[PDB]
Amino acid sequence: ARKETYSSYIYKVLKQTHPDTGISQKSMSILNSFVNDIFERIATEASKLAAYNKKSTISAREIQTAVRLILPGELAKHAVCEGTRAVTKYS
Amino acid sequence: KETYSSYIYKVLKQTHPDTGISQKSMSILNSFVNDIFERIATEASKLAAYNKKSSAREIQTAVRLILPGELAKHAVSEGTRAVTKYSS
Amino acid sequence: EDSESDMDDAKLDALMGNEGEEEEDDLAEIDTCNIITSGRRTRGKVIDYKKTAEELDKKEEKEEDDEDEEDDDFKE
Amino acid sequence: ARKSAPSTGGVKKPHRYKPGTVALREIRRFQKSTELLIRKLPFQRLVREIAQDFKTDLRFQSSAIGALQESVEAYLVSLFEDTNLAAIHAKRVTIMPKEIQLARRLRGER
Amino acid sequence: LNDELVLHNKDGFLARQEFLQRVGSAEDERYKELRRQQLAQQLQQDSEAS
Amino acid sequence: SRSAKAGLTFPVGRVHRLLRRGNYAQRIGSGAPVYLTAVLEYLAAEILELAGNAARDNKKTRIIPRHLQLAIRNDDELNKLLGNVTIAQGGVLPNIHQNLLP
Amino acid sequence: NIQGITKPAIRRLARRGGVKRISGLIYEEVRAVLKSFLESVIRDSVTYTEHAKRKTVTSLDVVYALKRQGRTLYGF
Amino acid sequence: QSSSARAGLQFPVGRIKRYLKRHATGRTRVGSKAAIYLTAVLEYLTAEVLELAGNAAKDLKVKRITPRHLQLAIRGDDELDSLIRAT
Numbered sequence: 001a002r003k004e005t006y007s008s009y010i011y012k013v014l015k016q017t018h019p020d021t022g023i024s025q026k027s028m029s030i031l032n033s034f035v036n037d038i039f040e041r042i043a044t045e046a047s048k049l050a051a052y053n054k055k056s057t058i059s060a061r062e063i064q065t066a067v068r069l070i071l072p073g074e075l076a077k078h079a080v081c082e083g084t085r086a087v088t089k090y091s
Numbered sequence: 092k093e094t095y096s097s098y099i100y101k102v103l104k105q106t107h108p109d110t111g112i113s114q115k116s117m118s119i120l121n122s123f124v125n126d127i128f129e130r131i132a133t134e135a136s137k138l139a140a141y142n143k144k145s146s147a148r149e150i151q152t153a154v155r156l157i158l159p160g161e162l163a164k165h166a167v168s169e170g171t172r173a174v175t176k177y178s179s
Numbered sequence: 180e181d182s183e184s185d186m187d188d189a190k191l192d193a194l195m196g197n198e199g200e201e202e203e204d205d206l207a208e209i210d211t212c213n214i215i216t217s218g219r220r221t222r223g224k225v226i227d228y229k230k231t232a233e234e235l236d237k238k239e240e241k242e243e244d245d246e247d248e249e250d251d252d253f254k255e
Numbered sequence: 256a257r258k259s260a261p262s263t264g265g266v267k268k269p270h271r272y273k274p275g276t277v278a279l280r281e282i283r284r285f286q287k288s289t290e291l292l293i294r295k296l297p298f299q300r301l302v303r304e305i306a307q308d309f310k311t312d313l314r315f316q317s318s319a320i321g322a323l324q325e326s327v328e329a330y331l332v333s334l335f336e337d338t339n340l341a342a343i344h345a346k347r348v349t350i351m352p353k354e355i356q357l358a359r360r361l362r363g364e365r
Numbered sequence: 366l367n368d369e370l371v372l373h374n375k376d377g378f379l380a381r382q383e384f385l386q387r388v389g390s391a392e393d394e395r396y397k398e399l400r401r402q403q404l405a406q407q408l409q410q411d412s413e414a415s
Numbered sequence: 416s417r418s419a420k421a422g423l424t425f426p427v428g429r430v431h432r433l434l435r436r437g438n439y440a441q442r443i444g445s446g447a448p449v450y451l452t453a454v455l456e457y458l459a460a461e462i463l464e465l466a467g468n469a470a471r472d473n474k475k476t477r478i479i480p481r482h483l484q485l486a487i488r489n490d491d492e493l494n495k496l497l498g499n500v501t502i503a504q505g506g507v508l509p510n511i512h513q514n515l516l517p
Numbered sequence: 518n519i520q521g522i523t524k525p526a527i528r529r530l531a532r533r534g535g536v537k538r539i540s541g542l543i544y545e546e547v548r549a550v551l552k553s554f555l556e557s558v559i560r561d562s563v564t565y566t567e568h569a570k571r572k573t574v575t576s577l578d579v580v581y582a583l584k585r586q587g588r589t590l591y592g593f
Numbered sequence: 594q595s596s597s598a599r600a601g602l603q604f605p606v607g608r609i610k611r612y613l614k615r616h617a618t619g620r621t622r623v624g625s626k627a628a629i630y631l632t633a634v635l636e637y638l639t640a641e642v643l644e645l646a647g648n649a650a651k652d653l654k655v656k657r658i659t660p661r662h663l664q665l666a667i668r669g670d671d672e673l674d675s676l677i678r679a680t
Contacts, residue, residue, distance in 0.1 A: 004608070008181045008255050013603050013640050017221060018647030020656060025250035027660045031642065034677070035635060039609065041680055042631060043616040050621055052581065053569045058623040059203045060630035067634055069564055069585075070680065074412075074672040075638065078217040083633035084208055090600040090629060091206065098425040099459075105424065106460050107467035111477040118593055119483070119502070123462075124455045128430070129437075131451060136439035140615075146444020154454060159496055166454040173449045176422045188607030192596035195610040196625030203626035217637075221644040226652050226669060239415055239671060241661045252657060278537060279516070285533040289481045289506040292533065293526045301521035302559065309563040318576035323558060326583050326590050328530075329501035331551060335534025336507070342536070343514060349538040350531075352546055359550075365678065415671050436619035480592070503592020515537060 005032060042066045060087065095121050131158070147174045181255075291324065298324055334358065417448070425452045462486065462493075480504040522548060558582050600629055604636035642666065642673075 010031065014023060023031070046062035060083070067076045099120050103110065135153035151170055155163045196203075211217075241247060256264025299320045306313055334355075341354035374380075417428035431448035465486035470478045484502050487493050522530075527544045561582035566574050576593065583590050597605045610628040617623060645666035646658040653662070667673040 002180060004184055006608070007253060009604060010639055010643070011253060011255050013636060014643040014647065014658070016603065017640050017644040018651075021647040021650050022657050023253055023643075024657045024659060025253075027250070027646070027658050027663060028253065030660050030663060031639065035639060037680060038638070039612065039631065039635065042634075043613050046623070046627065047616045047618055047621070049565075049568055051618060052565075052577070055569070056621045057200065057202075058621070058627055059201070060208075060624075060626040061204065062623070063627045063631045063634070065564075065568060069561070071676050072672045072679075073213075074670075075641070075676060077212050078641075079634040079637045081211040081215060081217040082220075082637045083630045084211060086600050086602050086633040087204075087208060087626065087630060090596070093426075093429045095425065098456075101424040102456060102460055103463060106463040109476075110463075110467045110470060113478060113480065115503070115592075116478060116480065116483065119480075119591065120459060122591070122593060123459065127455055127458070128451050131454075132434065132437060132439050139440050139442070144440055144442035147447035147450055149444060150447055150450040158454075159492060161492060162454075162458065162496075165457055166450075169453040169457055170447065170450040173421060173423060173453050174447050177420065177446070177449070184608075185605065188597065188605040189595045191607035191610050192605075192625070195614070195623070195628060198622050198624065201624040201626070203624050220637075221641050223644070225648040226665060228652055232665075235669060239668075241659050247659075250657070274538075278532075282532055282535055285529065286509060286535070287506065288533065289504045292529060293522055297518070297521050297523075301518035302555070304518050305556065306559055306563065309560065312572065313563060313566060314573040316573060316575045319562075319574045319579055322576040322579040322583075322590070322593070323555075323562075325501070325503060325592060326558065326579065326588070327551060327555060329505050329590065330554070330588055331530065331547070332505070332507075332534055335531060335536065339534060339536050343512060348514075349540050350536050350543050351540055352543060355543070355546065365675070412671070438617055438619045441615075499587075500589045500591040510535075 006035070041070055045070060095124055147171075291328065293324075293328070295320070295324060334362075337362065421449050423449050423452065423456070425449070425456050427452045465490070481506055519548075519552075522551070558586065561586065596625075596629075597632075600633070602633060602636050604632040604639075606632045609635070645670065 007028070010028070011023060014021065042063055045066040046058065049065060050056065050058050050062055064080060064083075067079055071079075094117075096117055099117055103112065131150075131153055134157060135149055138153060138156065139149060147170055151167050154166045154170075158166065299315070302320060302323060303315065306315075337358040338350060338355045341357045342348065342350050345354065347354070416426070417431075418424065418426055421427055427449035430452050431445065434448075434451075435443065435445075466478050466483050469482040469486045469489075470476065473482070475482060480502065481504055484504070484506065485508065487502070488508055524544065527547065528539060531539045531543075558579065562574055562578045565578045565581050580590065580593065597603075597607075600606070606625070606628050609631050610625065613623055613628055613631070642663065643658070646662045649662035649665055650656070650658055653659075655662075667677060
């Protein structure tokens with residue numbers, strides 16, 4: 001069959017950050033598992049929060065609020081910084 | 092606003108008909124019902140996420156996964172009774 | 180197999196934005212929360228080699244080289 | 256007798272009770288208690304005095320303040336049980352910060 | 366007895382009371398300044414020593 | 416309605432509608448709309464029996480929430496399957512140590 | 518307000534907690550930790566009060582905060 | 594052009610859109626901007642951890658990122674340790 005994962009994309013991100021260094025096998029497995037866990041937690045929190053707000057208007061604000069309420073200040077604030085810049089560049 | 096008040100009263104008359112109720116107990120029992128239901132459903136969905144899936148067996152196996160066997164056997168028996176009655 | 184995945188991503192990048200009443204964020208959005216400190220992309224910091232670890236825990240050949248060799252270097 | 260009274264006063268008499276038995280009877284009477292104990296109005300006063308720092312005009316509801324009171328009141332009691340068990344595990348029937356810190360570092364504060 | 370009223374009310378009870386309210390607002394703002402400095406120090410120490 | 420067809424006291428049509436609105440997965444077998452309802456009735460029935468005997472213990476016809484707490488805290492299995500919930504109108508079961516009392 | 522839970526209130530809470538003798542230098546740290554817990558829960562409550570920027574806090578907000586805080590509560 | 598290229602980033606949005614549509618709850622659905630923001634956040638965190646692990650490997654003079662370097666970077670940034678304990 002076929003499998004889908006973030007090998008090439010994470011490698012590209014690292015090359016942008018550290019071109020000389022790569023990613024090893026189990027280190028990639030660890031990173032992929034952690035990023036999947038983070039995505040699933042954010043998605044579940046956004047879904048249950050939107051259900052709590054009794055409105056079917058799920059914006060980037062749902063993911064933003066999730067990021068605030070599941071992750072400490074530093075990483076969340078920097079992520080929202082870069083996400084705001086990326087969104088206003090796309091928009 | 093479909094609540095379980097009528098169902099709760101029915102199960103009260105079934106178990107201890109002579110026993111009365113408070114004015115806040117029904118909220119506690121309704122919370123028990125729906126929160127147990129949603130957590131069991133979430134565990135069932137997370138278990139079925141790995142297996143390719145695009146009923147009675149899934150609910151029964153989710154119940155048997157985590158919920159204690161002392162209750163799981165009764166749950167399986169009553170679920171089989173319910174599905175047979177539905178098919179009847 | 181990355182080409183078909185990228186094509187599927189590009190195709191799906193347009194279906195999700197027209198799934199009903201969305202009108203995302205009212206075409207506006209709050210700026211960098213608190214203060215702007217993300218830098219360009221990262222912090223640009225490193226770590227040391229010596230007892231700096233013993234300074235770090237006070238501030239708060241993996242699985243053998245055969246397994247270090249076992250983990251194949253990823254090729255895009 | 257301070258002043259005019261039902262004949263001769265002083266009927267209170269020296270009737271001091273030694274501790275231990277009094278402590279046992281008061282804890283026995285307190286255990287059966289099931290309702291709220293601390294005053295609720297100072298509680299809402301303090302919780303509103305510590306809410307405007309985030310923002311003012313937040314407003315509140317009786318259900319809210321009641322739920323926070325229930326959450327804070329039903330959580331520190333288990334802490335009290337753990338501290339008492341850690342205390343009488345050692346030869347210290349009284350409570351000192353040592354066993355409460357012990358409980359903090361075994362209940363996973365982080 | 367009219368002119369003395371307006372020569373006395375220029376700096377009377379109400380003016381002095383309002384001035385005391387001004388100084389109270391000033392010292393409350395100073396307390397706010399102290400609070401923000403202290404909390405900022407707490408945030409700095411939360412990452413400079415942990 | 417649905418209860419008569421299923422032969423079960425607790426309604427399942429509303430419960431099944433809630434489950435369908437949940438959309439927990441792409442494959443949602445609809446052949447057992449009352450399975451979760453069945454298990455919840457069984458659990459609540461045993462809980463009600465425990466609460467009823469506890470209330471009859473202290474000549475209390477009406478179930479005080481303290482009786483409910485005692486019923487849900489007197490069994491090893493019940494406290495094992497959930498023990499992290501603080502119920503309103505608390506009060507732990509009486510206990511004493513061999514050192515505090517003679 | 519620092520002196521919300523006063524000395525007799527903390528004393529009777531401790532007696533309800535089944536302690537033989539309560540020393541006179543134990544309530545300060547307990548007050549500190551419960552104030553920290555209260556600050557955490559009110560911070561969470563004000564966060565989800567702005568989930569839809571609702572201008573009022575209700576039992577739903579605090580039960581949300583407590584149910585994701587790990588210390589689940591019941592009676593409702 | 595491609596929406597991912599339009600955002601000026603590396604992470605692709607479509608994968609997160611597909612994996613997030615699973616989290617739809619009947620009448621409740623999710624939007625594309627939420628997925629774009631999630632991709633931005635994921636790219637940021639992966640870039641941060643990759644930079645930290647690459648610097649740690651450069652300290653070890655290793656051209657390949659090691660999970661021990663990942664955990665050392667997590668330990669150094671206490672926010673990451675608190676997050677991984679929370680999640």
